[PDB]
Amino acid sequence: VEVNEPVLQNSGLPQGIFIRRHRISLPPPNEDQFYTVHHFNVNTDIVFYGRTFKVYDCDAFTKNFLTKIGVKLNPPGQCPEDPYMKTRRE
Amino acid sequence: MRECISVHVGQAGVQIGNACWELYCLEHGIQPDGQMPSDKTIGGGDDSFNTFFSETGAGKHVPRAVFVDLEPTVIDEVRTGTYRQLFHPEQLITGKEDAANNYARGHYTIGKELIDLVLDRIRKLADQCTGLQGFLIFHSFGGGTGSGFTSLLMERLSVDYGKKSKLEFSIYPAPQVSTAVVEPYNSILTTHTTLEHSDCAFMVDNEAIYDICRRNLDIERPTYTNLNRLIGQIVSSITASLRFDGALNVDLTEFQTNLVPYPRIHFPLATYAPVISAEKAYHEQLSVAEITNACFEPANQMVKCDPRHGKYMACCLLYRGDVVPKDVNAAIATIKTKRTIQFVDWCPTGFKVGINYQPPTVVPGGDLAKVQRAVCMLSNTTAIAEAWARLDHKFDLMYAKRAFVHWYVGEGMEEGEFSEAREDMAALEKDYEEVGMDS
Amino acid sequence: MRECISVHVGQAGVQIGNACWELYCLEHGIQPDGQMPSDKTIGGGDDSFNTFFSETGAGKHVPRAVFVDLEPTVIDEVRTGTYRQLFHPEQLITGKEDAANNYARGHYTIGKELIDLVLDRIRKLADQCTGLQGFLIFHSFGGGTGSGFTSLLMERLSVDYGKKSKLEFSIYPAPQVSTAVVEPYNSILTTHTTLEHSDCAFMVDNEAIYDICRRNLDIERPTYTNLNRLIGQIVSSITASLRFDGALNVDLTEFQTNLVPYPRIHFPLATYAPVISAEKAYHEQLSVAEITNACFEPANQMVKCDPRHGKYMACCLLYRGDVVPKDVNAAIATIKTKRTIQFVDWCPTGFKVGINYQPPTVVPGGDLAKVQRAVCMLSNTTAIAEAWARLDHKFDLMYAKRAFVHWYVGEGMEEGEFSEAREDMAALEKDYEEVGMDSV
Amino acid sequence: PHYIPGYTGHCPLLRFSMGQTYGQMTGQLLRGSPGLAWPPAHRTLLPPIQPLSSSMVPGYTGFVPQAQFIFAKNCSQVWAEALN
Amino acid sequence: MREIVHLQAGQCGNQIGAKFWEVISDEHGIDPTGTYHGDSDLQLERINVYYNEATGGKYVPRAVLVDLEPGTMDSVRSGPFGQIFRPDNFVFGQSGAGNNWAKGHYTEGAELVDSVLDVVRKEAESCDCLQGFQLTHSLGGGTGSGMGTLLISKIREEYPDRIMNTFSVVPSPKVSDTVVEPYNATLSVHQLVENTDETYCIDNEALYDICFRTLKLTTPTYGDLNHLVSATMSGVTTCLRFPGQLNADLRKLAVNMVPFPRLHFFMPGFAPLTSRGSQQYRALTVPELTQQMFDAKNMMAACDPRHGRYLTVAAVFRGRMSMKEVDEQMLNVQNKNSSYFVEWIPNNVKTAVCDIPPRGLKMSATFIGNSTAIQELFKRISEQFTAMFRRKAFLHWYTGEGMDEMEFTEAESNMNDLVSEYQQYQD
Amino acid sequence: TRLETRTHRPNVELCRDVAQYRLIKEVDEITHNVARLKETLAQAHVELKGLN
Ligand SMILES: Nc1nc2c(ncn2[C@@H]2O[C@H](COP(=O)(O)OP(=O)(O)OP(=O)(O)O)[C@@H](O)[C@H]2O)c(=O)[nH]1
Ligand SMILES: Nc1nc2c(ncn2[C@@H]2O[C@H](COP(=O)(O)OP(=O)(O)OP(=O)(O)O)[C@@H](O)[C@H]2O)c(=O)[nH]1
Ligand SMILES: Nc1nc2c(ncn2[C@@H]2O[C@H](COP(=O)(O)OP(=O)(O)O)[C@@H](O)[C@H]2O)c(=O)[nH]1
Ligand SMILES: [Mg+2]
Numbered sequence A: 001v002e003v004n005e006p007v008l009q010n011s012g013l014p015q016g017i018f019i020r021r022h023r024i025s026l027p028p029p030n031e032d033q034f035y036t037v038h039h040f041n042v043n044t045d046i047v048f049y050g051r052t053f054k055v056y057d058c059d060a061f062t063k064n065f066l067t068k069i070g071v072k073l074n075p076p077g078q079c080p081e082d083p084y085m086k087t088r089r090e
Numbered sequence B: 001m002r003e004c005i006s007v008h009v010g011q012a013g014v015q016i017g018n019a020c021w022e023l024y025c026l027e028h029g030i031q032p033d034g035q036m037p038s039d040k041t042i043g044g045g046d047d048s049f050n051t052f053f054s055e056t057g058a059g060k061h062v063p064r065a066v067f068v069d070l071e072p073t074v075i076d077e078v079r080t081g082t083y084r085q086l087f088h089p090e091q092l093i094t095g096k097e098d099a100a101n102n103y104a105r106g107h108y109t110i111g112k113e114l115i116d117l118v119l120d121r122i123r124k125l126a127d128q129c130t131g132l133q134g135f136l137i138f139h140s141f142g143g144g145t146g147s148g149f150t151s152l153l154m155e156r157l158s159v160d161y162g163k164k165s166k167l168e169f170s171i172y173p174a175p176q177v178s179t180a181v182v183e184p185y186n187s188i189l190t191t192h193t194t195l196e197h198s199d200c201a202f203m204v205d206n207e208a209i210y211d212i213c214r215r216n217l218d219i220e221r222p223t224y225t226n227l228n229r230l231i232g233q234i235v236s237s238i239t240a241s242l243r244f245d246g247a248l249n250v251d252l253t254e255f256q257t258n259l260v261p262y263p264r265i266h267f268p269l270a271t272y273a274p275v276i277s278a279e280k281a282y283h284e285q286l287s288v289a290e291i292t293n294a295c296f297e298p299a300n301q302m303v304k305c306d307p308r309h310g311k312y313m314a315c316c317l318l319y320r321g322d323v324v325p326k327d328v329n330a331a332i333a334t335i336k337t338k339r340t341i342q343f344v345d346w347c348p349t350g351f352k353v354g355i356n357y358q359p360p361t362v363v364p365g366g367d368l369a370k371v372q373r374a375v376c377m378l379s380n381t382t383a384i385a386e387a388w389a390r391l392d393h394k395f396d397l398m399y400a401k402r403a404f405v406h407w408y409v410g411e412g413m414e415e416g417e418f419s420e421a422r423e424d425m426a427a428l429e430k431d432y433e434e435v436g437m438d439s
Numbered sequence C: 001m002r003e004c005i006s007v008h009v010g011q012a013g014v015q016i017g018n019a020c021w022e023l024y025c026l027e028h029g030i031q032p033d034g035q036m037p038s039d040k041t042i043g044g045g046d047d048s049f050n051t052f053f054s055e056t057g058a059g060k061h062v063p064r065a066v067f068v069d070l071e072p073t074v075i076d077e078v079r080t081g082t083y084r085q086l087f088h089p090e091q092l093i094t095g096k097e098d099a100a101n102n103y104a105r106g107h108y109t110i111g112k113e114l115i116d117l118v119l120d121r122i123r124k125l126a127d128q129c130t131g132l133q134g135f136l137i138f139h140s141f142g143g144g145t146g147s148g149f150t151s152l153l154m155e156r157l158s159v160d161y162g163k164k165s166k167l168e169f170s171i172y173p174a175p176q177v178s179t180a181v182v183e184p185y186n187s188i189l190t191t192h193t194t195l196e197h198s199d200c201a202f203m204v205d206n207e208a209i210y211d212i213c214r215r216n217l218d219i220e221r222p223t224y225t226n227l228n229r230l231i232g233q234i235v236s237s238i239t240a241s242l243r244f245d246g247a248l249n250v251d252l253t254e255f256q257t258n259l260v261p262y263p264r265i266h267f268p269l270a271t272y273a274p275v276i277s278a279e280k281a282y283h284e285q286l287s288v289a290e291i292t293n294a295c296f297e298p299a300n301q302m303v304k305c306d307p308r309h310g311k312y313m314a315c316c317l318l319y320r321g322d323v324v325p326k327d328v329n330a331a332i333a334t335i336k337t338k339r340t341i342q343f344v345d346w347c348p349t350g351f352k353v354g355i356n357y358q359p360p361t362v363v364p365g366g367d368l369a370k371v372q373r374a375v376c377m378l379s380n381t382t383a384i385a386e387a388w389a390r391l392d393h394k395f396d397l398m399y400a401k402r403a404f405v406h407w408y409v410g411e412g413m414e415e416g417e418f419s420e421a422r423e424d425m426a427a428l429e430k431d432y433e434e435v436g437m438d439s440v
Numbered sequence D: 001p002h003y004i005p006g007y008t009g010h011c012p013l014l015r016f017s018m019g020q021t022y023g024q025m026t027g028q029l030l031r032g033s034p035g036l037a038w039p040p041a042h043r044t045l046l047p048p049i050q051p052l053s054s055s056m057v058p059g060y061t062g063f064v065p066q067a068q069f070i071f072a073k074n075c076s077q078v079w080a081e082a083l084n
Numbered sequence E: 001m002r003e004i005v006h007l008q009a010g011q012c013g014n015q016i017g018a019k020f021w022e023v024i025s026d027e028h029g030i031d032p033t034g035t036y037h038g039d040s041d042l043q044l045e046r047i048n049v050y051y052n053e054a055t056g057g058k059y060v061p062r063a064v065l066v067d068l069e070p071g072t073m074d075s076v077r078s079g080p081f082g083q084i085f086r087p088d089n090f091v092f093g094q095s096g097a098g099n100n101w102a103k104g105h106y107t108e109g110a111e112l113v114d115s116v117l118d119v120v121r122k123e124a125e126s127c128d129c130l131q132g133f134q135l136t137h138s139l140g141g142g143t144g145s146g147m148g149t150l151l152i153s154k155i156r157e158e159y160p161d162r163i164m165n166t167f168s169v170v171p172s173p174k175v176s177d178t179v180v181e182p183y184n185a186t187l188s189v190h191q192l193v194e195n196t197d198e199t200y201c202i203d204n205e206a207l208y209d210i211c212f213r214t215l216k217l218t219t220p221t222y223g224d225l226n227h228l229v230s231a232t233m234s235g236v237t238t239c240l241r242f243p244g245q246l247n248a249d250l251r252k253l254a255v256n257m258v259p260f261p262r263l264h265f266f267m268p269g270f271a272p273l274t275s276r277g278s279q280q281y282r283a284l285t286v287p288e289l290t291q292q293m294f295d296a297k298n299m300m301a302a303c304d305p306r307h308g309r310y311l312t313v314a315a316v317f318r319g320r321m322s323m324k325e326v327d328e329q330m331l332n333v334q335n336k337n338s339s340y341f342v343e344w345i346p347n348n349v350k351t352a353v354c355d356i357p358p359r360g361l362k363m364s365a366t367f368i369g370n371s372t373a374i375q376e377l378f379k380r381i382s383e384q385f386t387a388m389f390r391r392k393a394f395l396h397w398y399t400g401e402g403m404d405e406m407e408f409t410e411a412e413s414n415m416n417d418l419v420s421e422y423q424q425y426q427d
Numbered sequence F: 001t002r003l004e005t006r007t008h009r010p011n012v013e014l015c016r017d018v019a020q021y022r023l024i025k026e027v028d029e030i031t032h033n034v035a036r037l038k039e040t041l042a043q044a045h046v047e048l049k050g051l052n
């Protein structure tokens, strides 16, 4: 599992690759085992390294692959707009 | 009988003055709005308020105070504070624009748009009283509000009010740590006009309080609230023989006959002995002979001049609480046997002792403890020669190339007044040398 | 009155002081927050405590001791343990950076920064005395402030405080078993300073207590806090005549008159006689004849030196408990009849006894039993000279090549003061040689 | 809830009203002012009111969380605000 | 009641000036239509220092907006906070200054400075007891420099006891946005060495240096640069609008900084400027702002302060901090760095502490240095300009509008005189 | 709740007995049966995925 951030323009943060490509272990209840395909779905929160990301959409290829495997996807949620970038754009 | 007025001038004078008057309402029974509540068993006699209070009718007590400055932004939070109703409104007299660190803009330009009005309020306060023990002046040697308007006030009070006692309180500008750049320029034009109209004159510099608030009290990072809380306890001890009866009491007019050898040497030093913290002073006792040592310690003094290389001219102690005359005279026998303390050759009597029954009153929100007994000291030592002679150099670095003089000169004074006030400060440098040389 | 102020220096000095201030608080009635209980009375009343403790108005007892260290993390367990409400804060004097097992980093450079503070706090503990008996010093000859700032401590205590008694207990370096490699440069250069400044000086080796435990108190694997609880049983027993009333008293001044013949020889030995465990305590009757016999014995001595290679100059027995003055004298007269326990020719009297009523106190968590009577000894034998020569060899092994010498010379220190100090330790081995040769 | 007569500063809508004392008219403005939105978190007119932490000794030299942003207080008081 | 009326001169001055009312009105709970919707009474208790008041619960700024072309004033009303200005104060003309100092001073602005001095003095006679004036302009053109210099000499000769401010984004070597840029600048310091109480000098070259290095701002427009200036125009008028444990008005910093009567060019820089990435990893404390006031990176003017000598330093803080720790850290710097500080002035820092911070920040600070590093911003313009007056490169667009050749050697001698009065006092 | 308020018995009465040991047995019995139900439900979900 890799996590990336696309570079937005006037945000002052260091932007780019966030977690390097490696197998990621689970939260400490059942700590030893790593992530697999089944834990991943849409409109859920996934915890990597003390950080709980929120998932809101997929790809078309990901929809086809996950529906092939057998999971029914949730309805897609939405991403709340960044207040600083909204203020700077307007 | 025994009333005394207190005027606070300057932002430093007012902000000290808020601390002194939350001390004096809590000292007595009086609430913040001025009403003394009925039947609540306070520790005064009957007229224990009267030395700092008037008495209007329906259980209301008004202070004997007047707060003055040239800028309005620092008395307006006294006109809206918790103590807004305590004072009569026609005391807090504010100007329109400020001198902004000039004598020459306070003593010479804008002080005369206001000095006519405080000297009509000084009448209506001193018209009411029976007989004045003496005014109290509160000010700082930094700026021109608290040091230039102060100087014209004492040119006008020493003429109009005879020889009533005028105990000023100063803050000498700390040499290392300082705010203004022209602090020595203000503080050497001051000694020319406060060698003649202050009957007593005290000094406390801000840098020394910062050490005591670090070591003894354990307030790392003090602010200006803590520093003015301990100035009030020192003034509260000089006035506690007015209002509360004592086992051996000394008044305002008996320091002056006893502290001051010659009529040009009236700069004492003030110490308070169990300045100490409540979470720590649970452990140590405070005997009379223990807190007499802490007065004479070099580190506990309140102006950064070491008394070990100066020889004392007198002392003037003041004991409050649970103290007996045996344990006082036992401790003075110990101090005169140590070789480190030098007393001057022509002072064989040495000391001056006051004993009270009224303990120092703790202030909630404050930082000290509830101690049974405490000591102040009014030393008069030779060590003040090094607190003039290390602000008389910072003056003369800057005046030798005439930096900043072009601002004072335009607003009503000449080039000789900086010169006239510099030999008048190296004249007093010689009296502290010629007096302490032994026989 | 009868007051004595203890100064504890170094990590070994603080960790000894903790073990012997848990003893004193339990010896009198004092709880670990200073104040005695009000519902019960553990100790029967008097002002016994007023030679270690001191009282404010509200009935709180705060000890007259100052702990020092040049390193800030051994005091910080005193400040957080059970006895943190007992000590007034400015008695727990602490440093900023360590001493690094040098002397010249604790005698010339870093010891100068904390000699100003400790000589204004101890004048506020000797102000509130009326009659001060004398100081106590607790340290070890290994470290850098436990043995480098302690030399500069006593060089000023002999100046401003005249000749009040500066009694020191000490830890001598064990010579086979020793933690540091740097050790003989320490314990030569500090004996040269505490010759002319200390009034009495007891040595105890850490190795020599390790086998007093494992044979008598059958503790294989002793920790340093099993080891420190025996030292408090010595420090209390030499001062138990000051506090607790006795059939025959001895103060601190009457030791030095009766143990030290000449002004360099103030190095006693120690032995606590019924050092026994509670699985073996109540089957033996610990009669006074069999806890005076077991106190001269060369196994049980607390320094790694043997009294069968020299000859005794003076003894100082300290009985304590259920003892009668007659059975003391019936067992002194047995020891003197031996041809192996050799006493020196110019001391035909030999002994100094002291009898005290109060039995020694058992510590919760400790190892010894509550015994009914107990004995000390402060023997002054000729056989200390063998422990001068084993230190002299290991110093001289290194110093003929100048090993570790650049660490001391580079810190404000003359490079020829290692040879002043070896002739102060080569003169002192002849003094023990010449007070042992017989008069004929 | 009024300001005392010597007070200098800004009060809304003084300059149009007439023929009243300062304290009476200031009371009238603080009571009735429908046109202007009077703020809720106002800090001027105060009400007149009368004028572990012990698990470590006042000399303890170690790290205490969040206790370098607190000021004007004792060691025990700064530790009390940092923990509790 | 120490009120100050505001003047905004030129396209540079209006964009800087309209941002200052977008930040000060945000400091006082005021919506874009001007009325009050605030949260405290400390917002409203000294709001009459930059405002009149109109009936109905609305306040209007005391600003007069001046230009020569009418194009820029359409852009200020079309801005988001343009509704609040009184329309009687928009004073401007028909034609343009031509990016000429001379054609905006002699020819064109003289028919319009009569109209400015009627709406300026209407503000100044309605005041309670007037304290000061303000002016925002750039030293590189016609409307900012030229007529904005003429208006100062008419305010001063009628009100010579008030206090006066001036703001300047002075021209730079490395960036260059006008080819006659030194002719405009070198002539225009003639009335800023003689005829102003104060003048701050800022550099557009080092505005870009903070925005890329400190804030990591990828593409800074002119909106963010003017935000970075407006937090220092705010910073000097903080003790005048808000209480303090120690106080410093306009007049106090006039007396204390300026040693001699013609050295009043200052060097501002806001302290807790920090980036969005390192906002979460950074601690605010009173030592830590002092570390960032003083380094040569955050100075707004493009001179290096460690190339000269500091004469005096101001530091107008903002927040609840300890007055030991403020005074501890100025003893720190003068005794640590002691070559860079002047030798015949013993305490070289003026300090001040306010109470109500900038909104959002728990603590903040400001800095007003006066150094002898300012001569490399005057001497560097001098050789930038004297290359062109040798061959008379552009003079027929100034000489033909009413002036002669002696008025540059009159104003090059005076420009060299100011540089000569720093190597006097620096060494 | 049964163990939590049985442990407040006064001195001497606090004794180990058959009730205490049977309570300690049955709490572990209940946790074991809960874990078995968790396994059966977690594998029923993957067969539901297969049917989809
Ligand atoms: N002890 C104490 N000193 C203070 C306090 N406030 C300011 N100071 C000192 O006062 C000096 C400045 O002089 P001020 O008395 O404030 O000058 P001023 O009288 O207010 O003159 P203006 O500011 O023009 O009104 C500085 O050195 C401060 O250290 C205070 O609250 N307590
Ligand atoms: N008897 C005994 N000896 C100890 C104890 N703790 C340490 N030692 C001895 O102490 C010596 C080392 O010195 P330190 O304990 O470090 O004393 P110090 O003053 O801290 O020395 P520095 O670390 O250099 O500052 C070694 O000889 C140890 O054997 C103890 O609890 N009991
Ligand atoms: N701070 C700032 N400076 C500007 C802005 N626009 C232009 N400038 C500067 O102003 C200079 C132009 O001179 P200017 O005063 O605008 O000419 P004028 O207004 O037409 O008289 C250029 O050197 C620019 O560096 C802006 O939006 N903000
Ligand atoms: Mg002021």
Ligand SMILES: [Mg+2]
Binding pocket: C011, C071, C143
């Ligand atoms: Mg150590």
